[PDB]
Amino acid sequence: GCYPVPYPPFFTCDPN
Numbered sequence: 001g002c003y004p005v006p007y008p009p010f011f012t013c014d015p016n
Contacts, residue, residue, distance in 0.1 A: 002013040 001016070002011065004010055005012045
């Protein structure tokens with residue numbers, strides 16, 4: 001699952 005974040009990178013993704 002990937003969701004937006006405040007701190008860069010703005011793209012986050014889980015290890016699963």
